[PDB]
Design a binder for this molecule. Structure first.
Ligand SMILES: [Mg+2]
Lengths: 298, 298
């Protein structure tokens, strides 16, 4: 089988370059692909690239992911999260290709306690969540062979992440201010990429599994408890932290243009039973990525 | 499904901790496991641990892997590569568990040009290759639900590897001496771990796939051409190298106690058709691990 991956240098993309490699012949693109077009600002471009290669499977890990930035540029966000997705869907549905696509919990509003299911209604609180919804509906309406994985709080050890940004603060600052009222499960690019690889191989043999899935590491936490785990782990690894007091705070006190939900929790029972896969507790992934970060030599 | 992984902190083990995580409930052990025994010097210990947990799948990534050291300590090598493998096989075959086990091209002699198949005769040139053979025969004779993956020239980005060791030399030294007559395909722990995850899920639904497989990245190279690629890549990343002349050399000129083969090439058609998987060219894996090594920030 031939597989076409867009967004190869993103967090999830970099891990997909790895996970998809034994699944089939991988062509990995991004915006700077010279010999092929991987720029989602050119929907007809990405559409065309899809016709030029005829993949059995298209994995889209490209997206406009700057939530706040999206509010100011909802046209550019629409083009990346919706238009190009529709374009690639229509083109995919020509050869009967599968399309794997990543989406978000920002598709939902906010109601603490309750984890959202795929059978829940959607009302996006911000542009990013809105344009992503438009993309999944566009995929849903143009291509029956689809897998939509809604995820949240994504991190990877390659490049910038919450842990890193927070660790930079804990090295240089004395006291820190971090939210304790937004709830979710940090989900590793490792987990996303590997689940994707298994899900593809199920799908090719059981097309009935097509549809919408919630896909996140198990458990639930807040940015504050997430950060306390990062600091705890960094202390156990011999990283000294200027930080001596960790303070919890409400969301509102500090500006974010785009409304971020307080309840990002997702129920993932659907994914678990249809692919026969396990979704490990969120900490495992984060601890592993922290160990990799702290065990660098040269 | 429950999965039991021994050797979790080795090169392949560390990647298996990741790849096996969504496949089933993972219990990952190594020698220093306190609350469970993962020490292959205690064959009855590892046997017992296997009875205590009753896994559906046992993945053994533990082994005595110091080739030269093995010659001097063939008793310790025998205990780790053979005895404990037999012990875990017998214990596995009690509950009908699968056993995944890693082996080596050191099982074969040396005859340039020709890639070895699973239907080839074996005559191990050294103790490591000899004790590993004894382990695969012991697994083969005690446990019908087995997957043996013979691999070679294994590297990972976590911890020490050929690339790293060679890069350390190219930073500090002016001229280098490296073999150009031993042939094989460097195989990433990423590839081994991911193929293992897919192979397990095939095996559980088609037990007919049980058996011996050759499993290595595609293509073929020598340590010299491997090193020239590492240096080439390091030059393209802005790593300055004291090195200005790269010289090829025969194996013999410099001591290795244990005989290393000149022909480590392996034919992997068997694995490819039975699992419906791709085994990408060796360079891809190495370039990726080099990029990860060179793109470290803090
Ligand atoms: Mg990795």
């Amino acid at each position: 089988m031939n597989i076409l991956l867009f967004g190869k240098t993103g967090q999830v993309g970099w891990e997909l370059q790895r996970s998809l490699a034994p699944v089939g012949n991988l062509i990995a693109l991004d915006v700077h692909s010279k010999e092929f077009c991987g720029d989602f600002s050119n929907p007809k471009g990405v559409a065309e690239t899809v016709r030029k290669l005829r993949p059995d499977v298209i994995v889209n890990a490209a997206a406009h992911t700057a939530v706040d930035k999206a509010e100011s540029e909802p046209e550019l966000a629409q083009l990346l999260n919706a238009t190009s997705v529709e374009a690639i869907a229509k083109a995919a549905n020509e050869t009967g290709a599968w399309v794997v696509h990543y989406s978000t919990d920002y598709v939902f509003p906010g109601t603490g306690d309750i984890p959202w299911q795929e059978t829940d209604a959607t009302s996006p609180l911000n542009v990013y969540g809105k344009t992503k919804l438009a993309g999944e509906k566009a995929l849903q309406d143009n291509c029956p062979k689809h897998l939509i994985f809604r995820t949240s709080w994504v991190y990877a050890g390659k490049g910038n992440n919450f842990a890193k940004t927070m660790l930079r603060l804990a090295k240089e600052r004395q006291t820190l201010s971090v939210i304790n009222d937004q709830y979710g499960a940090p989900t590793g690019a490792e987990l996303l990429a590997d689940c994707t690889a298994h899900a593809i191989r199920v799908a090719l043999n059981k097309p009935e599994v097509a549809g919408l899935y919630h896909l996140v590491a198990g458990g639930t936490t807040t940015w504050h408890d997430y950060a306390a785990l990062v600091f705890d782990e960094a202390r156990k690894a011999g990283i000294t932290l200027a930080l001596t007091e960790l303070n919890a705070v409400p969301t509102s006190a500090y500006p974010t243009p785009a409304s971020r939900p307080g309840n990002s929790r997702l129920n993932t029972e659907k994914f678990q039973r249809n692919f026969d896969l396990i979704l490990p507790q969120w900490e495992l992934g984060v601890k592993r990525m922290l160990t990799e970060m702290f065990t660098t030599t040269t």
